[model samples]
Target chain A: AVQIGFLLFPEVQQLDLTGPHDVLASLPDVQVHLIWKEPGPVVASSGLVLQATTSFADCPPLDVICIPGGTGVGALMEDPQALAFIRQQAARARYVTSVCTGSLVLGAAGLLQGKRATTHWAYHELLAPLGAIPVHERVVRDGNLLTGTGITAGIDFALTLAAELFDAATAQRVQLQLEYAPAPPFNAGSPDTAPASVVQQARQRAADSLHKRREITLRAAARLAA
Target chain B: AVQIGFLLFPEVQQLDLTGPHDVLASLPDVQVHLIWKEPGPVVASSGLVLQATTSFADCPPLDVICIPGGTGVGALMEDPQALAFIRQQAARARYVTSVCTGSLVLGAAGLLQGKRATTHWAYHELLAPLGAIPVHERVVRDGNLLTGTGITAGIDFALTLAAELFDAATAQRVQLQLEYAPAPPFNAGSPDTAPASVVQQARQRAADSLHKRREITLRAAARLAA
Candidate 1:
């Protein structure tokens, strides 16, 4: 069986993980794991609790490793154990991937260095400081490293990975099963697409969190350089 | 604070709950709860463990109640306690909602009678037998009864509900925060859109579950009639 795992942690954006989990877990001969520092419940940013299936020490060698981004990603950027686990798996995994702010976590592990990757639009510029060539697309792939743009992008990202691991036909079949047809009631998903007022409000809402993330990212980058 | 709760159970389609949870939880003054028969770790259809924050006996009078569809929903169709709980909540909730086959649970509770509703396309026809005017739209709203077409449709359904609960502007803001711009990599999201072969494969994959659901649904309808 092809083994796939996601790095589960406290304050994860639940959909960042669940969106991809829904898509990837549907594939044939694939076993999925929620890996964390230890086996227990991890509460997401939205206050939903998710349990990890395996601890870092007990994790199987993964064919694919996915990291999801959320409010908790800032602290993880400075976590040695999290970074070490990512680095180890990314070294041998056929595919290293992330969704939303998850790209930031992979960047912390030095995996995105010189690679074209995408992240949440609000944090897209931050990737450049971490040695990643930031792109604006919904999903980006540089060899075996794949990253998705933002929260809902996990669905798109996982479908892309499905096509790579199996085939376009397989991915299409999964998409139909999930009924992934999206119909957003508003035209405000991206900074470029959103009205200026909506974008300004979003920036304000995330201001404090972004400030803290910026500090954590710089510290992690300094450690990587050392 | 406005309270929203999802009925959680073992073998639930995690995305059915998480997609809408993510969208609705982002709203201001909203407190989301995962309510179950009891408080504990409930494993989803994909083996991901999700915690239920409140037991049925301890749940607050929620402003909104959401029921998600999955394999476990078949048993719930005939569960008296579950049906009673749904009836109690729906009596006062500003909006009664369901995603995918969760509509079946609502139908069994004698709630969907003659109401316009929808479910996963594969089970859409079954809604009519349950006394609902089955609609084929992505998100269907007839009065306070709102239902989504399938798994990913939960996202669209929640966004539409958001606009109703708050304002269009508030919903638009949340949409931007989620980066709700969807970029589906394939066109096979629905039977109408997918190739016949792909739809056939999806139907085959779900054949057993569908068959079992039909049997349970017919029995529940008879019980409701009696």
Candidate 2:
């Protein structure tokens, strides 16, 4: 049986983890566990507390290891426990996949070194400082490492990963089951498609958060290398 | 601060809960908590474990109570401790909402008597015996009771509820933030939209469980009226 381990942390993004979880769990017979660095409850970036099955110390070996991101990505830069855990897992995980700024966390763990990775667009530039090639794609596949862009890309990434892990037929069947044909009423998901005003509004909202994330990530990278 | 409480249980549908949780948590400055009958680890229908913040005995008054449903809904129908708690909460909750068979759980709690409600298409008929006026629409709002049809409907339900509770502009902005112009590529979601073969496949796949859900709900209704 294939085992999927999801790295859980306090303040992790719910969608980042959940979107992929939904798709992966739908497989006929797979065991999916939410694993944390520790045993206690972990809060999502959205403030939802989640209980995990196993800690980093005790999680079973994984065929697929998913690292999800959100505002929690900001915390990864400072969390020694998280960095250590990611480094340990990435070394042996058949596929180390990340969603959202989860790539940032992987980078902080020094797992992205010399690898092509992608993260939430607003923070793409931050990857290079961690010794990774930053790609601004919705989803990036580098050897055995997979990375996805911001929030909603988790769904697309799951489809992509599903196709790779299983087969195009299985993935397509699941996609059909999920009704993956999206019909966003507004053309406002990306900086390019969104109205200029909406893009400006998003950028304005993120101005403070972007600065804070950069500072946190820089500090984390320095600590990891030190 | 608006307080949102999510009822968690063993085998509860994860998406029905998380999809809306994703939207509501994204609301600027909203306080939300995941509540359950017990305070510790709660396993979802899909095998995911979620920790709850408040127990039935300690959850603070909620502006809204959201429910999600799955195979676990049947188990909950047989659980008086869980049912009593739900009844107590729904009595005072400003808004009682749900997705999938979650509406059936509410019905089992005796909260749906004479109210227009909706659940996943496969289980809509089950609610009729619970005395709920079953609606075929995806979301049926009667007064403060906002129930949804199926899993993905939670997203639409949350967007609409946000529009109702907050302002339209705020809801629209959130929809944009969530990139909620849904473009589900498949016609397999609702029974009405799915092909006959697909619908038959789903029913066959779920036949035993659906029959069991009806049995559990029927007994719960008898107990509620007693």
lDDT of each: 0.88, 0.75
Write candidate 2's Cα lDDT for B52-86 as tens digits: 77888888888888887877788777778888877
TM-score of every candidate relative to the true structure: 0.97, 0.82
Instruction: Name the lDDT of candidate 2.
Output: 0.75
Off by over 4 Å in 1: none
Error of 2 at A6 (Å): 1.4
Best by TM-score: 1
For each candidate, what's the DockQ?
A: 0.80, 0.24
